[PDB]
Subunit: 114 residues, 3 copies
């Protein structure tokens, strides 16, 4: 790191999302509420796109919720995964794929930038 | 079934989502955590698109959470709805519209497919 | 009000979302489950677009969950924010930015509109 999103990989050619792994081992319990998991991946995103961070279905089904996150086109910070253990104690091992980044078109509008 | 996504219907012409129903009667309690509800609808999706499964607002407000799900362009499995009773006991009757499929453009990138 | 979405503002030029504030002071507890917060902003959306309502990351991290909401292209009602206190008591002050509206392309399909 810092590593750009061009280093992320897709599971398969037809996968919508780019996979995201935590760089740490983390244990989460329901009483902890939302935690921001480090990925060591950084924006910004390709021109005219923004990002959505979503959970992987297999991880959601194992009781780890990823709250959808919006990554702005010009965000240059670290992409973090906002996560919560739903019901039980969840253990995230270093390098496990926990979420996915989806890229979507950024529509321009005349909304004021105030 | 198997039924393709072309069999899904929109509530109205201007509806973003295609409605999804469970093919079973299911009761959900908060302690159960995430459950994958059968729809009997199968991918794949139209060329150059991927799917997002989201909750219907009326169903969310009645205490059933649908976790956002990504449906890859070339997924040929059954589209399932990942769902949780938030606070109370929720009963899903066979044929009730529980979620919606939204289609979005699949942006191509040079990310490796490893 | 009624106020149209053209009155919403972006945090910065590169922000994907248009910010949404509640027009009321609201306290939320976990046992309350989902609440629909008033914004005094109304659809409809620009041609060929639909909307997604998502949480702001800073608000999610402070324990207020926004359930993703789909806003249809031709929705002319009030845009409400579906929200839940995750673990703790959350207080929403009048005018605090609580969610964001993202605009996305509405793909046309031949799905029946029944
Ligand atoms: O899961 C997420 C969500 C957002 N982020 C980063 C990227 C995004 O561009 C940035 C700001 O996100 P939001 O607009 O959702 N957050 P907020 O409204 O609290 O911050 P700001 O006022 O800077 O826009 O936070 C993540 O790293 N992970
Ligand atoms: O709500 C959902 C989410 C995903 N799915 C299916 C369709 C999608 O293409 C497939 C894989 O989804 P994810 O990439 O989110 N899951 P995961 O990363 O666990 O599986 P894989 O390693 O196969 O990519 O699972 C559903 O049926 N419902
Ligand atoms: O967060 C949200 C979600 C939806 N809505 C409004 C806008 C949208 O067009 C409308 C209908 O949303 P859904 O299709 O998700 N709800 P549902 O399927 O329950 O209603 P309908 O049968 O009218 O389509 O509700 C909001 O105001 N906030
Ligand atoms: Mg995957
Ligand atoms: Mg609907
Ligand atoms: Mg913001």
């Amino acid at each position: 790191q810092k590593q750009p999103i061009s280093k992320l990989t897709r599971a398969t050619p037809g996968s919508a999302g780019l996979d995201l792994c935590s760089t740490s081992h983390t244990v989460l319990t329901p009483e902890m509420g939302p935690q921001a998991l480090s990925t060591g991946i950084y924006g910004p995103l390709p021109p005219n796109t923004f990002g959505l961070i979503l959970g992987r279905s297999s991880i959601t089904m194992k009781g780890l919720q990823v709250y959808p996150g919006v990554i702005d086109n010009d965000y240059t910070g670290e992409i973090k995964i906002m996560a919560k253990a739903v019901n039980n104690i969840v253990t995230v091992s270093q390098g496990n794929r926990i979420a996915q980044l989806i890229l979507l078109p950024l529509i321009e509008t005349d909304n004021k930038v105030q």
